[PDB]
Assembly symmetry: C4
Homo-oligomer: 390 residues x 4
């Protein structure tokens, strides 16, 4: 019988490398015979036996006749879908889990938990599914687009932890954490500290005691809010990342935000979901992050790392590790996840590479994956290979 | 080793919410590369591990060259098909179970039973399949279109109960129930009471002792015949639902049928299969029902509920619970089903949303699913998103 | 662990009924988006858990550009393929087992055995595959198109029995039987009696001791050669069926062949593979057969039955049971098979319904299935629904 | 519970025969509705339960709009993919394992190991994946296109051995072997002897003590370098095959390289990966090889065998065993593999049949399979059946 899973030590390694590209629109030509789904906000979550590649589809394929509206975020057609990682998400390969315009998912060792938010902007609804069964919901508390992570939730000993938020995209958005067990919400956690705006948290285990998240402040700062959640006391605290290497887009020059660690600085309005994943060693913790190559545009994606220290207090620049996507290619959302090897966990970062041709045509994304493997330096970047005119 | 299943107490909850849309014709454009099957009369049935989405296909895809005849009900090509719930029912995803122009299916805890009626109108034949094996048949007893539920049958302790009927759609159609065990009919059950017209029953467990069904009278009344079947004595009785909230379509204004509960009233000719599902609690029983928003057309779908009482005797209006499908969208057949969570059952209602462009084009359907989940009020409605011109 | 299978008593029943149509070319329109494979000689074989639908493909799809040659029988491209019964055999659903222009297959309780003959006409080669592994071959002994059953072989206690033949289609073709165990040929059986021409045997168990086959004489007679094979002594004898109801096509009027049971009569040249399946009861054996409705053309298919007696000696007409395919629809090869229910076997007959438009267009087939189920009379016929111009 | 696998004695047999053709571009017509992937360098590897058909795709389908570049070898889009052997490798059937422009894979009895090399020419990177997890890397040691076998690696007792090489295609390329256990490289093995150029080794077990490989020298000779790797001491030595039957393409006339076994001779520049597989018997060893029918072009494929002796010392011609592909058809890379029967191993040779129409059109391949089976002589050749204009 399957047991609850826990975070384990990470597999040996000191550099990330290019692992896999999932580029469904390489097969979406009018000259072709395929039906890749139109998606955005992909993420990956893994259990003991398989990884699933999730996304939010507009319920439309390329080529097709429903391109109009695919540049939008929320409508009554959007669904959370998945395929086994490594499969191309087409109309036929994919499975439709639930209606959702914001999502998350995770495996607790026994079963998959799926999370989807839908409903009207002023009264949206988070829905929880455990395996095939719809099991619970959570209601909007600020009546301003309740929404969730767009990346994997995190389970330990059967308790799955999930960030949600609600509030104006250009004002206050005070997040909360839900503790969910076998598909049912058993506790709400209200974070303390710097809470004025936190959304799209990318979260993972720093240890058996602590979940950490690197999130997006869409109104006030280009520093990322950083959550430390103690899963033993079920309490969370949030402070801005102090590093000079500001991880949001847009952002000012590195190090140019004057004042104490808590200072907001300029170019704070706007944002992007960012990649973040832990490398747990015997007596060290590696924190790996990604940010766009452009300071203002969703172009390129670079990988950064820092071992140990307090991210709330260290102003040190992160160490640049490598270009995962060049400045000539799209770099949109990024997320962390861990693959389960036989005895250890493999930290990875995925990158959403959006095909953006404006509102007059289809709008979708490829997914690039980089994982910790071996030593040395990160060697190759990723391109989608897609010509949007075909 | 698998054991026989029994109905269990329902999962906690007090409102339904939008769960999932299966809209295969979102991919049926001539500009596209997909092959959704042309279907009608979808329904869902679940076993301990998976849910299956069934329908009757005309053995034709969209886009395709066999649209002519897809608006008809019975022919030599119609088949019962299924996919795993969440998969799009295409030519390649689907499995063809048996020739059938009327259908049902259910899981007894060990194996699937599939039910399909075909043959000439004056001498049709119900066929039973257990897993891969064709195991039994039952003959027409009135020689006027023997037909069955178009929704899940119900199994308890290995015994599966199924409504069948036979007789004029505009006259007498006295139903019977079959008791089926491991694919073989072991008993016929002859209901007493108000028996002159009962078809397309939507059935479920009120408890371990009782199956209840809400059915269609296509001839005499807009009230639904309501079956109570005692599975301990294998006997059944039928009376009209007394509620002022008449569930058939067409129907007169609510409460306008004067006289005692048994009064047939006006606008009784015509009808539609209706959603019905139980919420079994320790000391009370919830009965959830759906009906079109239009009193005369197959447009829209609203949800209603009433706890406890006797549906044969209570004239009280059902409580309106919300709009699942607005009156601007098609609302055709609806059906109940239950998903098996680990320790409890989740009641759901499914809605057939027919794409009707007349007899000169294709004729098929989407399926929308609403399930009991959380508390509060039902929040969002469903659209198919399909433009039939594409 | 799986055990060797043996023939069991047949499930209760006294009539066949229409079960299932597999008509892949309903989705082969140029207006469509599917890829049904171009096939002929379908047959079905079942194991304890699933039935497989086999055919010989020309390695070409409809619509496609390789129609030229699909009316032929033997070339270097033909392969034995299968899908799970109930799936449409398309390019993607199908699995390609081996190069073959004549085939057979069967399950021994533990594993599938696949049989395929290919090679040049004057030195063809039978190949045996057990699961994934190629395990043995048998060589041509008459150097005149070695060929096999085009229907399921038959396994008992791990020993699988298979008819092969070799010789002129318009002269002598003396068949042999191979005994194969775990993919390896362990014995050749040389039949005695009337052996001058036997091919395309349709075989099944009359009991644990005896396999019987109804075969095709393509040169001398419209009576079918009938094999009795004793699997306990591994000996076989062949005599012509004596019944006045001649099962081959073409054929003279029933009963018109004068003289003793062994008389050949007129219209013997030409032939067709015929359906034959056993209904094994406690103290009776039902023999079910099929033949075309037309005496000279591959049009229509009717079902016949006789209980008990010696088919070598009884001149009695078989009892007509029902029209499975009308005289207006194609009726080509037919075959027997048995589905394994939990405790008993279900006898079935499948019918190849060839789409024949001549050599200037594609040439393929649908498969119709009829099985023993319930009592009464056979109620409905099967049509392919295909318009070859689309 | 699974155990480590070891090479076993080969199944009985004395000749190869045509087994199976995988020709996905038979379905790639513009008139069709399929999406075979554009691939090259296919190979097959088998575990205890299934065989997988691997290839390197250009991440493009036929028909499609990305043909430009498919005649090249290395780019940022190439991926290692697989399907179950017998399935057509299409967009939807295939699974994408990892970014790779050179590949290998093998099963150790418990799990699949996948090998993919990508990165820039001057600093390429071998990546190892065990099941779903990326587990290790190995760096370029000569900074000139690190590359691997393009055929199955070989596992014994959980230890998997793999050839890699690095260096100029027209100069020195000294190979090494990696010993890999559960996805992690545990030893590097440095061969001695004739080491100046070895690439694309086709390797297999001669016994539990010895792996042998037949490789390609793209620079110096038409003789194949022949590796003997002792897995008990983890050491290797390489010498040229002495046989007069030179296996490379191009090559001079058989026997025309004068002088001792080590003589390089003429027409050594250029080369092709060659098929090689062992037939292990109680007291003898069969070595089966394939080479093109043309001495200078990649046309045709013939099979050769020799029992016993020392391939380093014996100048004797190999025995010609038959034409697998005629000189009218393409014969490109070939490879060995073994299928696991229940108690013994079946040696096979696979042949890449490239569809080459130049750089102005698509460039892909079919795969033909020949396996040891039965006795006598090899009887039929393979054609792809593909018209590139369609
Ligand atoms: C309808 O009748 C069935 C059969 O009696 C009821 O199912 C039974 O439910 C009880 C309690 O709900 C189960 O007892 C449990 O046994 C497990 C061990 O298997 C134990 O760990 C639990 O603490 C509990 O004692 C019983 O197993 C179960 N039987 C079967 C065959 O499933 C069902 O509850 C009834 N439905 C109603 C009342 O709505
Ligand atoms: C390479 O070495 C391996 C490991 O020693 C050899 O595999 C072993 O082969 C022997 C006989 O072929 C197997 O013995 C058998 O054991 C079973 C019970 O498991 C018994 O029923 C049989 O009668 C027989 O005694 C042994 O199990 C097997 N070991 C493993 C781990 O597979 C292999 O034969 C060698 N390859 C050669 C010599 O080519
Ligand atoms: C978190 O705690 C779990 C629970 O103890 C740890 O999992 C155990 O790890 C040890 C070896 O480190 C194994 O021997 C046990 O079998 C594991 N138990 C379970 C239930 O998996 C886990 O290693 C801890 N995570 C760390 C230390 O990073
Ligand atoms: C759609 O199908 C119907 C019924 O098959 C067709 O109507 C028949 O047309 C034929 C003409 O060949 C007449 O002989 C029959 O009497 C008609 N039957 C009925 C019931 O009207 C109709 O033609 C088809 N439509 C198209 C566009 O082909
Ligand atoms: C043929 O022989 C087999 C072998 O005995 C019979 O299978 C047995 O059937 C009995 C009941 O009839 C069971 O109790 C045994 O468990 C079966 N054994 C196996 C190995 O399956 C089979 O019934 C015989 N076929 C007939 C009588 O038609
Ligand atoms: C096929 O691809 C090649 C390489 O990408 C194309 O060749 C390039 O064409 C551009 C024109 O925009 C030149 O600037 C480059 O110098 C060319 N590169 C090389 C290596 O020649 C070629 O045009 C493509 N073919 C087609 C038909 O589009
Ligand atoms: C979608 O775009 C079209 C223009 O192409 C516009 O007319 C239409 O109103 C848009 N849809 C909605 C829902 O506004
Ligand atoms: C196939 O038919 C064409 C005519 O459409 C003919 O020219 C060709 O020769 C035929 N193929 C063979 C192999 O003869
Ligand atoms: Ca910001
Ligand atoms: Ca009515
Ligand atoms: Ca004849
Ligand atoms: Ca060379």
């Amino acid at each position: 019988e399957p047991e609850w899973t826990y975070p384990r030590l990470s597999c040996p390694g000191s550099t990330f490398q290019k692992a896999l590209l999932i580029s469904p629109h390489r097969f979406g030509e009018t000259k072709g015979n395929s039906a890749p789904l139109i998606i955005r906000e992909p993420f990956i979550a893994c259990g003991p036996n398989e990884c699933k590649h999730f996304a939010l589809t507009h319920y439309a394929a390329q080529p097709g006749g429903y391109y109009n509206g695919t540049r939008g975020d929320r409508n009554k057609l959007r669904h959370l879908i998945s395929v086994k990682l490594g499969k191309i998400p087409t109309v036929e390969n994919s499975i439709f889990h639930m209606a959702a315009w914001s999502g998350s998912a995770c495996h607790d060792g026994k079963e998959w938990t799926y999370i989807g938010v839908d409903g009207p902007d002023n009264n949206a609804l988070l829905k929880v599914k455990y395996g095939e069964a719809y099991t619970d919901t959570y209601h909007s508390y600020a009546n301003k687009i309740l929404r969730t992570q767009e990346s994997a939730c995190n389970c330990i000993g059967g308790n799955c932890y999930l960030m949600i938020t609600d509030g104006s995209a250009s004002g206050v958005s005070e997040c909360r954490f839900l503790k969910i067990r076998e598909g049912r919400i058993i506790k709400e956690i209200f974070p303390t500290g710097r809470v004025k705006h936190t959304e799209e948290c990318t979260c993972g285990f720093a240890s058996n005691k602590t979940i950490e998240c690197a999130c997006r402040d869409n109104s006030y700062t280009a520093k990322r809010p950083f959550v430390k959640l103690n899963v033993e006391t079920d309490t969370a605290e949030i402070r801005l990342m102090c590093t000079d290497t500001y991880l949001d887009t847009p952002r000012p020059n590195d190090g140019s935000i004057t004042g104490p660690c808590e200072s907001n600085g300029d170019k704070g309005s706007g944002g992007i979901k960012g990649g973040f994943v832990h490398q747990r060693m015997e007596s060290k913790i590696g924190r790996w992050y990604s940010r766009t190559m452009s300071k203002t545009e969703r172009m390129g994606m670079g990988l950064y790392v820092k071992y140990d220290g307090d991210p709330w207090a260290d102003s040190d620049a992160l160490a640049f590790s490598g270009v995962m996507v060049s400045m000539k290619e799209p770099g949109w959302y990024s997320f962390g996840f861990e693959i389960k090897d036989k005895k250890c966990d493999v930290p990875c970062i995925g990158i959403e590479m959006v095909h953006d041709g404006g509102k007059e045509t289809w709008h979708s994304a490829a997914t690039a994956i980089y994982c910790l493997m071996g030593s040395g330096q990160l060697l190759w970047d990723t391109v989608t290979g897609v010509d949007m005119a075909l």
